């Protein structure tokens, strides 16, 4: 069976929380509460075939900065999970991007940009911003709305595929 590394990133104020459980059990979660280090795997049927993701959710702090070269040794897709309600995240997604790829020390990178907290009327961030910075990546962005079940396995399944292509 393949395995895909997948880990969960972003800021703080986002939910991550919601994200992971919404995609295992399929519950939504208002109460936020920062995890350092859970087990999310689940298996899915990804273009007729079941495989089993392997995802790890980390901490968006500062503070956690050492273990972060041990898990992005391991990990081969990032989920950069922003939020339209703060500018900042997305900000800090290109400083998040600078370490990603710092690590990965390649310039060619099978990741996706997707933001959550769609379902806010503060909508900070407008995807005008986002579909024109994916144009200097050269990745698409995809919105993710995990609020009422709207993007979420389609921008997941993508990304499968990106990955499944590049080992072929
Ligand atoms: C118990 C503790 O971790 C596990 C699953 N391992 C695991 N490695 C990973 C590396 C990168 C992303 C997700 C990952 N998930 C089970």
Same mark, same amino acid.
């Given at each position: 069976?393949?395995?895909?590394?997948?880990?969960?990133?972003?800021?703080?104020?986002?939910?991550?929380?919601?994200?992971?459980? !919404?995609?295992? !059990?399929? $519950?939504?979660?208002?109460?936020? /509460?920062?995890?350092?280090? /859970?087990?999310?795997?689940?298996?899915?049927?990804?273009?007729?075939?079941?495989?089993?993701?392997?995802?790890?959710?980390?901490?968006? =702090?500062?503070?956690?900065?050492?273990?972060?070269? !041990?898990?992005?040794?391991?990990?081969?897709?990032?989920?950069?999970?922003?939020?339209?309600?703060?500018?900042?995240?997305?900000?800090?997604?290109? $400083?998040?991007?600078? !370490?990603?790829?710092?690590?990965?020390?390649?310039? /060619?990178?099978?990741?996706?940009?997707?933001?959550?907290?769609?379902?806010?009327?503060?909508?900070?961030?407008?995807?005008? =911003?986002? =579909? /024109?910075?994916?144009?200097?990546?050269?990745?698409?962005?995809?919105?993710?709305?995990?609020?009422?079940? =709207?993007?979420?396995?389609?921008?997941?399944?993508?990304?499968?595929?990106?990955?499944?292509?590049?080992?072929?």
């Amino acid at each position: 069976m393949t395995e895909y590394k997948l880990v969960v990133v972003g800021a703080v104020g986002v939910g991550k929380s919601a994200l992971t459980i !919404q995609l295992i !059990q399929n $519950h939504f979660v208002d109460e936020y /509460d920062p995890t350092i280090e /859970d087990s999310y795997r689940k298996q899915v049927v990804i273009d007729g075939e079941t495989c089993l993701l392997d995802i790890l959710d980390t901490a968006g =702090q500062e503070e956690y900065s050492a273990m972060r070269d !041990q898990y992005m040794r391991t990990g081969e897709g990032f989920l950069c999970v922003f939020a339209i309600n703060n500018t900042k995240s997305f900000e800090d997604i290109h $400083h998040y991007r600078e !370490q990603i790829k710092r690590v990965k020390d390649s310039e /060619d990178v099978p990741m996706v940009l997707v933001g959550n907290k769609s379902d806010l009327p503060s909508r900070t961030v407008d995807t005008k =911003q986002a =579909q /024109d910075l994916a144009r200097s990546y050269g990745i698409p962005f995809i919105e993710t709305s995990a609020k009422t079940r =709207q993007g979420v396995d389609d921008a997941f399944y993508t990304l499968v595929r990106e990955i499944r292509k590049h080992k072929e």
